Ligand binder design. Structure first.
Ligand code: HEM
Length: 399
């Protein structure tokens, strides 16, 4: 059994193993970092089954849960939030924060999303590139999702920049373990302080809703409110940064489609749909353990055996997406959903938010900077290490 996670085939490519497994062995066994064995599911239809089967569990204290690192086995000891829960607990807690993320709520946030993007682009413009390239990640791709989720949680304007850098340090590949843990505690310590303040004087933000509607009536306590706020922060931010950077790199790699996007900014939503299928920057979240024996394809997964369903491979499934390895924002979409945001009850709570952030970004970026250009050769882009989810660490640009 091959060791898993597989490495990406190259900087922007998925692992080469998925295409071969989809063709020859779509439900196979892989070996995890501790020598344990989990099932790997690669085909779109089977990934949807894994994501919705009520015979499967996300509870990480169950036997056989497929932790992918030693830190994850550590994290499995802490008290879970809704990301690691089964029904009925899952939606009991998830419903406490879902109202901010509904399509209607995200619709009403569009002026604020646009303002945030415009303000950051104008800061980047004033900073300029007169003395050499600037890092699009630091100047733009990082602060856009960071400022938005922090503002939704309840962080005041004056605290955004410091917390944005601390959260970035938390996952930066160049941080020592001590640096990352320190930044992590800085975030937890801050959210505790913010929860205490909103318990005394609530405002119009997610933490205040948790404090008034759940903490004070005793449905959860204030440490739960911290952990739920921390989840909303860390679950999606690094992925949002990578999606923005990957979108810019993808357009540089496909100049004909960038030309179409410059000539018609209303193509941003279709660009974003294809980006989220083609670059599956969160590909390891659909994990389960079997509560009871369950048949998947031609395999029997035994009770207490672990399962990883690759939505990245599902999104390149040739049976669903014609010519799946070509990036084409003009493609005709089949009836089947692309799975960039997962599937089933646990489907990304922030899917509409994320698509609105990405659509705002790519309908505005080249109107502000029509000559935006990646300043290094595209083959030299500093991607995330191949053993991790696809992404970009830094992206020098001029404009
Ligand atoms: C393009 C950006 C994003 C992508 C591609 C993405 C992708 C995903 C994926 C693949 C999952 C697993 C869903 C499943 O279990 O089937 C997920 C879950 C989740 N995402 Fe995102 N996400 C993004 C942005 C965000 C943002 C911005 C937030 C918070 C503001 C967020 C919060 C969450 C949470 C809390 C969950 C767990 C939901 C649950 O288990 O009920 N994500 N996301």
């Amino acid at each position: 059994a091959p060791s898993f996670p597989f490495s990406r085939a190259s900087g922007p490519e998925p692992p080469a193993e998925f295409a071969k497994l989809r063709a020859t062995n779509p439900v196979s066994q892989v070996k995890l970092f501790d020598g344990s064995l989990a099932w790997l599911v690669t085909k779109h239809k089977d990934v949807c089954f894994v994501a919705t089967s009520e015979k499967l569990s996300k509870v990480r204290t169950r036997q056989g849960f497929p932790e992918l690192s030693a830190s994850g086995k550590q994290a499995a000891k802490a008290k879970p939030t809704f990301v690691d829960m089964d029904p009925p607990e899952h939606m009991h807690q998830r419903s406490m924060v879902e109202p901010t993320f509904t399509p209607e709520a995200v619709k009403n946030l569009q002026p604020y999303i646009q303002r945030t993007v415009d303000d950051l682009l104008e800061q980047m413009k004033q900073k300029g590139c007169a003395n050499g390239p600037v890092d699009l990640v630091k100047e733009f791709a990082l602060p856009v999702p960071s400022y938005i989720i922090y503002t939704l949680l309840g962080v005041p304007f004056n605290d955004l920049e410091y917390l944005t850098q601390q959260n970035a340090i938390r996952t930066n590949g160049s941080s020592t373990a001590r640096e990352a843990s320190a930044a992590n505690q800085e975030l937890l310590d801050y959210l505790a302080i913010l929860v205490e303040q909103r318990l005394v004087e609530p405002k119009d933000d997610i933490i205040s809703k948790l404090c008034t509607e759940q903490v004070k009536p005793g449905n959860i306590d204030k440490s739960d409110a911290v952990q739920i706020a921390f989840l909303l922060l860390v679950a999606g931010n690094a992925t949002m940064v990578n999606m923005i950077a990957l979108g810019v790199a993808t357009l540089a790699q496909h100049p004909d489609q960038l030309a179409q996007l410059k000539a018609n900014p209303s193509l941003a939503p279709q660009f974003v749909e294809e980006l989220c299928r083609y670059h599956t920057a969160s590909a390891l979240a659909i994990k389960r353990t079997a509560k009871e024996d369950v048949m998947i394809g031609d395999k029997l997964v035994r009770a207490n055996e672990g399962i990883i369903a690759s939505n990245q491979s599902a999104n390149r499934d040739e049976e669903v997406f014609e010519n799946p390895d070509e990036f084409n924002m003009n493609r005709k979409w089949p009836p089947q959903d692309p799975l960039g945001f997962g599937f089933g009850d646990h489907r990304c709570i922030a899917e509409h938010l994320a698509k609105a952030e990405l659509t705002t970004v790519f309908s505005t970026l080249y109107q502000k900077f029509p000559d935006l250009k990646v300043a290094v050769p595209l083959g030299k882009i500093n991607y995330t290490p191949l053993n991790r989810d696809v992404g970009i660490v830094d992206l020098p640009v001029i404009f």
